[PDB]
Amino acid sequence: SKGEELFTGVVPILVELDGDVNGHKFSVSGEGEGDATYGKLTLKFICTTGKLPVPWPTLVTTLVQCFARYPDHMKQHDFFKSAMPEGYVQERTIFFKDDGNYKTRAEVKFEGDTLVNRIELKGIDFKEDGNILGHKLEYNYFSDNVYITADKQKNGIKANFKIRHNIEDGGVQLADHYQQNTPIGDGPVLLPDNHYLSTQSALSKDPNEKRDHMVLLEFVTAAGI
Ligand SMILES: [K+]
Numbered sequence: 001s002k003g004e005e006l007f008t009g010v011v012p013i014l015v016e017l018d019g020d021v022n023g024h025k026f027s028v029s030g031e032g033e034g035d036a037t038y039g040k041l042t043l044k045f046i047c048t049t050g051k052l053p054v055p056w057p058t059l060v061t062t063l064v065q066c067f068a069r070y071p072d073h074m075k076q077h078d079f080f081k082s083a084m085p086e087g088y089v090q091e092r093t094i095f096f097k098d099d100g101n102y103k104t105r106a107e108v109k110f111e112g113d114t115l116v117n118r119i120e121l122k123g124i125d126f127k128e129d130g131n132i133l134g135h136k137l138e139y140n141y142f143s144d145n146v147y148i149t150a151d152k153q154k155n156g157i158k159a160n161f162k163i164r165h166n167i168e169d170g171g172v173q174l175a176d177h178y179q180q181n182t183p184i185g186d187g188p189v190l191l192p193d194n195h196y197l198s199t200q201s202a203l204s205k206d207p208n209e210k211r212d213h214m215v216l217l218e219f220v221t222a223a224g225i
Pocket of ligand 1: 137138
């Protein structure tokens, strides 16, 4: 595709989210860079409206799969880069088991030489003393597989996966993800064979930063072919 050549080096990334969860409104801004040669993302997010009303870990997935390392033998299955520079719409429902759900819609595209992810999140039916609104999740690390399949009728893809969010002194808060991506442009895109993205997210803090924030180091690699 044309789009693949946009990712051969280090690309600056901007993320902007507006959220509304059980009536609590909030915004997040993120900056960093992605190096798709290595599947490597480094990002820092700030809650610009003050204190974040959900746990940071629950927003990682929402807050640029075009930075996946696709092995050379799977380059024909890389929908994400094939949609660039015009981009794709990424939409999700995220099902928090025994709790509410997030519904997200994002546009991922280049603005100049900057890869931008603009997101609207709406969360409904959360328990106000639940693990999410009660801030009962650990802040550390999670890893999983994003199972991707073609959706020929929207000229895009679907995916699904499950995140096991660690509960502080406890088990796991499951977060079932259902995803669709559709190209923004009229251009052609690569419709993939079934495969997955193996993704590892490491969360940390900037010792100098007083705002509510999250530092993210993530690796994303396509596999399963
Ligand atoms: K938390």
